Amino acid sequence: WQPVYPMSQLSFDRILKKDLVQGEHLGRGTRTHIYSGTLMDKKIKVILKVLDPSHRDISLAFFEAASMMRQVSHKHIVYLYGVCVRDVENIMVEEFVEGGPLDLFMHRKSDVLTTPWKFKVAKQLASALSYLEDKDLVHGNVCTKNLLLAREGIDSECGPFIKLSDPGIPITVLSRQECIERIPWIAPECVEDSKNLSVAADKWSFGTTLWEICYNGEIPLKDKTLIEKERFYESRCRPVTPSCKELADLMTRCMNYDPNQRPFFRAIMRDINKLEE
């Protein structure tokens, strides 16, 4: 879009290791561990995404994703306070989102989630992705584990409010095995060649994420081997159609094997708003 030399703008001085306290381990991502933490100037609760000690290649890519999160500003995208270097550990320091990951939440509440709640989550995500598409940015790690609940909106007068977390290490530098592991969220062209990553990749992943929402955080292809996941895309399959025809139809449109045929998020938003009338 309009930032100039954004990685040159990343500050390795703004958040110093002496002011960051690491808290409990919360989860893992691709070569990463995620922790609770506290950032002292009065203090703020933060999330730390810590990259495994890696080659220069992987660290640079990790910082490029951090830089993109720093440049974007959208109410449905997690805020990144900055980065911290702690000897050989490279760390993204993000705001703490109190409700936690959406997958865990849906597992825990599968028996009280309603249709409008699910629809609101989908619409908020489309809105974040529309914003990224407008800026020619790709995320590449859209899934419910990477959606954080700022407001639960179960028994509240207000509905849910989600925030999309950072992408972690860009697909650009992942191994073929790591790309296969990410099936069926990863766009199939990126499995063929990680160089195929493009804005269209996030449409495919948004489809898989709608599948997860429809199925209350169930993991699609859970326990399938890498060889079976490979087979899945080689045979041009899609996960089973949800009951909810409105979300199933968006899912099908988005999970087209031709990236060029996946509709724009602009159009998905127009359609979602139309459904609301």
Side-chain angles (χ1 to χ4, degrees), residues 16-219:
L16 293 174
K17 71 178 180 193
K18 65 174 183 69
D19 294 321
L20 193 63
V21 173
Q22 185 173 313
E24 74 177 340
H25 183 276
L26 294 168
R28 301 172 65 127
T30 299
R31 319 181 198 191
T32 59
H33 295 266
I34 305 169
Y35 304 90
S36 196
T38 289
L39 175 64
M40 316 293 295
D41 246 319
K42 295 171 195 158
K43 52 196 207 276
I44 188 191
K45 202 158 178 203
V46 293
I47 283 289
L48 304 185
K49 186 173 283 185
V50 182
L51 176 69
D52 289 344
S54 298
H55 298 133
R56 277 177 276 271
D57 284 35
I58 306 305
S59 310
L60 174 53
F62 184 77
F63 285 132
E64 195 174 25
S67 171
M68 176 186 82
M69 292 294 291
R70 197 85 187 71
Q71 294 299 323
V72 298
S73 176
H74 187 278
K75 63 180 182 193
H76 296 298
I77 300 176
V78 169
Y79 191 82
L80 182 142
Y81 279 108
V83 293
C84 178
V85 171
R86 188 176 67 198
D87 339 289
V88 309
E89 297 181 294
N90 296 132
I91 310 177
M92 288 174 184
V93 185
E94 298 167 340
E95 63 178 336
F96 190 88
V97 183
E98 170 183 334
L102 187 71
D103 63 332
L104 267 25
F105 182 82
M106 295 189 290
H107 295 162
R108 179 156 78 72
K109 299 284 181 201
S110 57
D111 292 17
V112 289
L113 304 176
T114 69
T115 293
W117 186 97
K118 287 184 182 178
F119 196 84
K120 282 192 191 49
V121 171
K123 188 191 149 147
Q124 294 180 354
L125 177 57
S127 173
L129 297 178
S130 187
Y131 170 96
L132 295 187
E133 168 190 275
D134 281 349
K135 313 294 166 301
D136 300 309
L137 296 178
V138 83
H139 188 281
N141 218 337
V142 180
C143 57
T144 67
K145 181 191 55 207
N146 282 331
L147 308 176
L148 283 66
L149 272 168
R151 192 206 305 129
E152 293 176 2
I154 286 303
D155 40 282
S156 161
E157 47 190 18
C158 317
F161 196 107
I162 55 140
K163 289 188 188 158
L164 176 63
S165 192
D166 70 273
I169 301 171
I171 280 169
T172 307
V173 299
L174 299 180
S175 70
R176 187 186 168 70
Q177 176 174 325
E178 287 167 326
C179 290
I180 297 157
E181 169 170 50
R182 187 170 300 183
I183 291 172
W185 286 274
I186 187 164
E189 66 276 14
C190 295
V191 176
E192 295 180 42
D193 197 325
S194 60
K195 304 169 199 279
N196 292 332
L197 185 65
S198 74
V199 175
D202 282 332
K203 276 78 159 174
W204 179 283
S205 307
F206 177 78
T208 309
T209 299
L210 295 181
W211 189 94
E212 295 182 272
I213 292 162
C214 288
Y215 288 99
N216 307 308
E218 166 169 358
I219 297 278

Side-chain angles (χ1 to χ4, degrees), residues 230-238 257:
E230 268 186 275
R231 176 176 174 189
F232 191 85
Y233 279 4
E234 163 189 279
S235 301
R236 304 275 203 104
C237 317
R238 268 167 198 73
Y257 278 82

Side-chain angles (χ1 to χ4, degrees), residues 234-246:
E234 163 189 279
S235 301
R236 304 275 203 104
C237 317
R238 268 167 198 73
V240 56
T241 312
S243 286
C244 178
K245 171 173 154 58
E246 291 63 32

